[PDB]
């Protein structure tokens, strides 16, 4: 499996990723860690699993819900306080590291369905819905206040910056929108390529990155977050996520076992050929530290970063 022919892009000398099969065929959608060893992952069909060895092994945790059809979209821990949101609207909360969980009934006025929750610690969190509504709680989810008043269309692939900014691609990739605290509305931006936008996020140096249709990426101008550099073609395949491990080491995950690494901040790319054996799209890269990282696949497949 995964034999790559001569003439491909240069190969990485080393493979730091190990494939793990979870005790499920459910697709995993998000993961969050309390500390270096204790973490949680969530996915489709209300899948919830816990690790206590840093993600080498995972155990399912039983929940008693009214049904098991929920898609758990996002999980976030800050210390022992953890939150999960999913669709159709559901929110779960823990204050003891996930020993016990409570369902927080969501106000039926909630606009759209939850797509992301961010734990801020000590009773605070913010939640974003697929229509770009943003709500903050400070009292463990009893009350929520809107942080934005207005938006356009359905958002996709929400990403949050270290300072609490958000960027989102529209549901058809025709444009993207940004928001930062104090804005009453998202601000939409026209895309700069013919190719439809698939995903966008933040670099560790205050820029945006974007993945566009046809296996191309680009980075915004440091002088001007609204000017974009030249389109790059890492593989000369569609890409699904991009994530930094360090300021200069970038990983780029795509369909059918495609996984590339750049050690020069995105200038040149090398293929991790070893993971091409694994029969899965790579949907999402999560680095929790320079040493600890996971890639979410299908059918209960994860890749785990081993420090080497």
């Amino acid at each position: 499996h995964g034999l790559v022919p001569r003439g491909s892009i240069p190969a990485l000398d080393y493979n730091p990723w190990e494939a793990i099969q979870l005790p499920t065929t459910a697709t995993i959608l998000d993961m969050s860690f309390i500390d270096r060893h204790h973490g949680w992952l969530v996915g489709v069909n209300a899948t919830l699993m816990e690790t206590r060895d840093g993600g080498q092994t995972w155990e399912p945790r039983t929940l008693v819900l009214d049904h098991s059809d929920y898609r758990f979209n996002s999980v976030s821990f800050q210390g022992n306080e953890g939150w999960i949101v999913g669709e159709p609207p559901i929110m779960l909360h823990t204050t003891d590291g996930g020993q016990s969980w409570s369902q927080i009934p969501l106000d039926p006025k909630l606009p759209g369905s939850p797509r992301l929750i961010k734990a801020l610690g000590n009773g605070s969190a913010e939640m974003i819905t697929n229509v770009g509504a943003i709500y903050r709680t400070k009292d463990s989810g009893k009350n929520w206040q809107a942080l934005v008043q207005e938006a356009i269309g359905v958002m996709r692939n929400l990403n949050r910056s270290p300072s609490g900014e958000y960027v989102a691609v529209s549901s058809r990739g025709s444009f993207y929108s940004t928001w930062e605290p104090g804005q009453t509305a998202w601000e939409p931006h026209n895309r700069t390529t013919s190719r439809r936008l698939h995903n966008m996020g933040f670099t560790p140096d205050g820029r945006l990155w974007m993945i566009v249709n046809g296996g191309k990426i680009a980075f915004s101008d440091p002088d001007n977050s609204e000017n974009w550099g030249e389109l790059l073609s890492p593989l000369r395949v569609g890409f699904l996520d991009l994530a930094y491990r360090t300021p200069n080491e970038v990983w780029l995950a795509g369909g059918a076992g495609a996984l590339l690494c750049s050690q020069d901040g995105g200038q040149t790319w090398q293929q991790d050929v070893d993971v091409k054996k694994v029969p899965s799209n790579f949907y999402k890269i999560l680095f929790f530290s320079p040493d600890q990282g996971f890639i979410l696949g299908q059918k209960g497949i994860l890749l785990r970063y081993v420090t080497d």
């Binding site: 369902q103 770009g132 929520w144 809107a146 207005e150």
Partner: peptide, 18 residues
């Protein structure tokens, strides 16, 4: 489609699920 969002939400009391 433009949307205008409720400014405040409130949650009923939580129920244990685990």
């Amino acid at each position: 489609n433009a949307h205008n969002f409720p400014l405040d939400l409130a949650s009923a009391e939580s129920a244990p699920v685990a």
